[PDB]
Write a protein that binds this ligand. Structure first.
Ligand SMILES: [K+]
Ligand SMILES: [K+]
Ligand SMILES: [K+]
Ligand SMILES: [K+]
Ligand SMILES: [Mg+2]
Ligand SMILES: [Mg+2]
Ligand SMILES: [Mg+2]
Ligand SMILES: [Mg+2]
Ligand SMILES: [Mg+2]
Ligand SMILES: [Mg+2]
Ligand SMILES: [Mg+2]
Ligand SMILES: [Mg+2]
Ligand SMILES: [Mg+2]
Ligand SMILES: [Mg+2]
Ligand SMILES: [Mg+2]
Ligand SMILES: [Mg+2]
Ligand SMILES: [Mg+2]
Ligand SMILES: [Mg+2]
Ligand SMILES: [Mg+2]
Ligand SMILES: [Mg+2]
Ligand SMILES: [Mg+2]
Ligand SMILES: [Mg+2]
Ligand SMILES: [Mg+2]
Ligand SMILES: [Mg+2]
Ligand SMILES: [Mg+2]
Ligand SMILES: [Mg+2]
Ligand SMILES: [Mg+2]
Ligand SMILES: [Mg+2]
Ligand SMILES: [Mg+2]
Ligand SMILES: [Mg+2]
Ligand SMILES: [Mg+2]
Ligand SMILES: [Mg+2]
Length: 86
RNA sequence: UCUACCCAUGUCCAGGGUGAAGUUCAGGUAACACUGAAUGGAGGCCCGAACCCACGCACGUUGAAAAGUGCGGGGAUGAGG
RNA sequence: UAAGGAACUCGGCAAAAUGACCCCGUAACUUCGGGAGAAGGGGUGCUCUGUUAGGGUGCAAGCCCGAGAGAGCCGCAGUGA
RNA sequence: GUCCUAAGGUAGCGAAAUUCCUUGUCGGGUAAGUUCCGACCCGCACGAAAGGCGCAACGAUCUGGGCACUGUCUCAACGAGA
RNA sequence: UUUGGCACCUCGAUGUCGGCUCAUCGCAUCCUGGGGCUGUAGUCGGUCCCAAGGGUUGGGCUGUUCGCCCAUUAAAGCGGU
RNA sequence: AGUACGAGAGGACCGGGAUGGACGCACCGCUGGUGUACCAGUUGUUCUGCCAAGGGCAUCGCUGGGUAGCUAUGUGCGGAC
RNA sequence: GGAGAGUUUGAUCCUGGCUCAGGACGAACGCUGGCGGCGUGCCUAAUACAUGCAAGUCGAGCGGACAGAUGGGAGCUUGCUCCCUGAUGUUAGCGGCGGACGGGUGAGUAACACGUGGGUAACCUGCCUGUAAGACUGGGAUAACUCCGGGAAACCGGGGCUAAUACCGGAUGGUUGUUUGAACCGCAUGGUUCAAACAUAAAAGGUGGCUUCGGCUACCACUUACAGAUGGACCCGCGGCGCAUUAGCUAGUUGGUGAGGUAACGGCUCACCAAGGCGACGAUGCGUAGCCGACCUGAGAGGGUGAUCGGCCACACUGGGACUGAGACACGGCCCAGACUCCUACGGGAGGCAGCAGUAGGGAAUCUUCCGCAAUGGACGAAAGUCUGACGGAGCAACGCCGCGUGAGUGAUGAAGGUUUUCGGAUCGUAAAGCUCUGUUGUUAGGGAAGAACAAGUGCCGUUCGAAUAGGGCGGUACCUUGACGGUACCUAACCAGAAAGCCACGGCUAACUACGUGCCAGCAGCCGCGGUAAUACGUAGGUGGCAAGCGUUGUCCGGAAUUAUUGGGCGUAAAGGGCUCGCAGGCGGUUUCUUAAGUCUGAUGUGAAAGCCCCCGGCUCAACCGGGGAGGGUCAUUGGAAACUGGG
RNA sequence: CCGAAGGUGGGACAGAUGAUUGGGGUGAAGUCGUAACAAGGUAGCCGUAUCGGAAGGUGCGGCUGG
RNA sequence: CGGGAAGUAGCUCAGCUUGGUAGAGCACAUGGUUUGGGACCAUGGGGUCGCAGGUUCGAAUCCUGUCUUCCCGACCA
RNA sequence: CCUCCU
């Protein structure tokens, strides 16, 4: 940039994204664990995965990444699959 | 007995493609036109071996041969061989 | 056969290049048939899914034909001559 | 106007498979084009079934220009066989 | 070296234009070397003299020789065989 | 030496030095070319009984490389004094 | 609430064009030019840009340098030095908010972009202000600073550290999801309210004062729910461009089903199915264009425009993409590509004037490289304040509109003085000659604006919190303070009406003539037309109606033009009946009665911003201007009637 | 995987320009004839054909606006 | 390159071949004409013969050079 | 058969 607070906002936002991507990745990985568990026929693990998923989901909401409606949509999708197993 | 043309009588032409007329059905109109689809299988039609021809080049030129060979080339259901 | 690429030559003569199948796509002009394989592009091996879908034959068993997909694997290159 | 004729060449095309002069002139294409294409018309010496002018398709036809392609060439080198 | 004149060799054959390949010779010198004169200030030139050692381009058009043109070059010589 | 010369424009001789073009000689260390008794990949079919691994033929089957040798477009040197 | 005129003929009536008088403007060009007050000023090249400036702030988040010194210390030339970290200050760097606003331009867009229409049951909604729970308990890293290595460099990578109101762990959290049922229902998809379980999810403290040093506070402020509000998103009816010498278009195209994505509904994306969708009521294509409030014109219907000013939209050197978040898929960011500018010792960096000024270029043509945040509004902050080319001012330019003027008034020589000539004149002309009276303004010196509300700082008092008298905040209440313009507007007072009149037109339309010089020449011309040796329209010279420092000329639009005719025209001979049928669609349709109620009509309710123009219109001395209450505004909803007529049975 | 820019290709459309060529308009006093307007000296005009320097002529059919 | 032919007023041409004379048409100017024109009629002005040299008593004329413009010719089998 | 321009 050619402004002081622009150069800060350049340097800031890069460092934010890295940290932010972590939590999305963590969430998406935690979502994959639940999805993977449906194939293997193992509800007991899927519940314990869904908690860790739900934690990682809601951490992104706090930071300001996943919208409350976005989170609402995900936890819906997962819970229907878990109940659809039994 | 070569060759030109003709006459009688035989015979040959691997394969593949294209898709004329007609027909049927559907649409279509007062009738016809006309349209589509399917079917159909025309042609000195197409690509291409055999076969027939002989366009280009090279070679050969006291030749392997008094007209050929090699590599390409043209026709190849026809006014065909 | 380096680099170049018709500068050669009367003249690209000769040679090189193109070349199969499937798919996409294809202008002027036209006698409405054509032009047309116009042009220009893409795909092409092998393995598994797979004795695939589907088809022929058969009472079946079996034998034969066989797309199109998906996932891979290898090479400089798969109509590998 | 005048002379001559049987009648004086229409349409179309034209430096042409025809044009001597001639590489006509102008334009196009090329760095450069006696060839080629388009124009023009002083047609030496086109011209209407010894047809005129066009024309899709067709051609081992002739001509000019491109892309590709190459030992055709710059300029030649090596290898195989006879 | 031209066009010719003559008709002497060759009509029981002296292949005939241009190009390609290979040159070689002359000098009336295109370039380079050396000079004189200049209407030679310089840089360039002009003109004549000496000099034949070596050098003297690739293309477009045309069968062309020649020529014109493009682009170069120190120069793009003229002739004989 | 922007010296001489010239109003300027321009712009030398003579003398130093560097580096080319064309031409020639040699040579393969380098860059490349070729390299049919080198190495490798690969198609079809056929043979070594079969598998695996190989051989034959298909332009050296084709394709990618390549040693020596021979080579130019490559390198060195020459026409100096 | 609506005016015509000239011009076809020898003359006529008609048809028919042409031209003129009006108004308008972002104007340009001539010639000319005094001042003032409001307004306006790249319409061309969304061309390229030298230079400067246009968004920075919070030290009461922050460790840290670097200062401060109230004091002790301080060797001692009283000259200078100092050793401790004073209250606290300056705040590179970290963290927060803003930077998505404000400002600019209209390139693209024929589209739910816009103007008038819904879900809000398809959404979102930080900040602000309420009502409703909390900041409890885990640490671990990292800038700066330093150490090391780079970079001539520009810029930067490692190492050990340190902080934070930066970040992450865990409990319990009404939100959220899931499930278990209810309650209650709508416009189908449903929605709203309640209860338990399972799962998940919270914070942050920095200031000043008081601590009984247990803590308890309070402005600020961190975090959670139900609100309100605000600003966005999607969807839809209906509207508003040209060309058929553009007739077929489409293949995620049209619908389904499923999956995914999205704040959100949805071919929005994809998989798998079908075969649809659109179009003569104009699809598709091409062209042109931001739309609207409005603006110009007109009796109105209409027509044209969409500079300035307000709203919606779109864009930000060209093009693509996401990140951050409540919110850009960024106007002074980044990532990548491209064309241009800059730097680079060549490895690599930096930027986008459609921000204000300015430059070049283009062009008929459009400003100052200005001063100030005093005012208004922002951002930041608790505040002081800082930043603000937004904004206020000023510069420039007759580019508009208009001021109130540039006097009033007494005064007949009709003088002076003019160009004509029937050698005489006549009009300007009560206007000046000679004045003589007043200060709208200004000719020069003295007074002097308003604009300023203040915000705070301070002093006080009711209220609510307060362990509380702390100590602040919020209602009434003092005191306090600041002006770019600018010593500028406006007043007084002289020198004094001195400084302040103009331009254009004068055949006719449309109120306004003669000498001379040309001689179809030179020239003129909106139209009709003038000039060939007596030119009331040409060259010159002397002479006069409108509006008022300008008005002529050219350009554009509406009018006149009942001249595209719905209002409001035509087709025997002026332009105009298809050569004539058969007919698809379409348009139109006898009489009665019944019924219907789409059209038709009608009542009631909601919106159609602000400005502008306008009805009453007021205020500012009237103005060249600002406020309120109305009205218009709809082929518009929703609902209740009426039912003759048109339509349906 | 998608994907801007770029590359390649064959078409579509629009503008500019082009040797030359075609009519058209305009232009005080050019050349040729005299076609039309009168029965315009062959009544004219419409469609069509053909011919001719040029207006035009001629055929066929039509019209009266003879 | 060689050979021809031109070159005369503003423009187009005679005169050149046989030496003595500068003409013609159009344009230009003036007059006539007419209201004024146009056309027509009459009357003028305007070169020194592309440039230079030569021969001659004397050169547009004959000879040469030069410049400009045309025309013709220019292997060979 | 024709009858210059204003
Ligand atoms: K050639
Ligand atoms: K041919
Ligand atoms: K002989
Ligand atoms: K070698
Ligand atoms: Mg055949
Ligand atoms: Mg064949
Ligand atoms: Mg053969
Ligand atoms: Mg080669
Ligand atoms: Mg090569
Ligand atoms: Mg050649
Ligand atoms: Mg050659
Ligand atoms: Mg060949
Ligand atoms: Mg030529
Ligand atoms: Mg060639
Ligand atoms: Mg003949
Ligand atoms: Mg004959
Ligand atoms: Mg003899
Ligand atoms: Mg003999
Ligand atoms: Mg000699
Ligand atoms: Mg070796
Ligand atoms: Mg080698
Ligand atoms: Mg094997
Ligand atoms: Mg064998
Ligand atoms: Mg064999
Ligand atoms: Mg636009
Ligand atoms: Mg009207
Ligand atoms: Mg008539
Ligand atoms: Mg009529
Ligand atoms: Mg009729
Ligand atoms: Mg007549
Ligand atoms: Mg007659
Ligand atoms: Mg005749």
């Amino acid at each position: 940039p050619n402004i002081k607070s622009a150069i800060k906002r350049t340097k800031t936002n890069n460092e934010r994204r890295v940290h932010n991507a972590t939590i999305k990745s963590a969430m998406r990985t935690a979502i994959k664990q639940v999805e993977a568990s449906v194939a293997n026929n193992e509800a007991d693990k899927a519940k314990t995965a869904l908690t860790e998923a739900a934690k990682r989901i809601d951490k992104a909401v706090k930071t300001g990444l996943v919208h409350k409606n976005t989170a609402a949509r995900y936890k819906s999708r997962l819970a229907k699959k878990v109940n659809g197993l039994s």
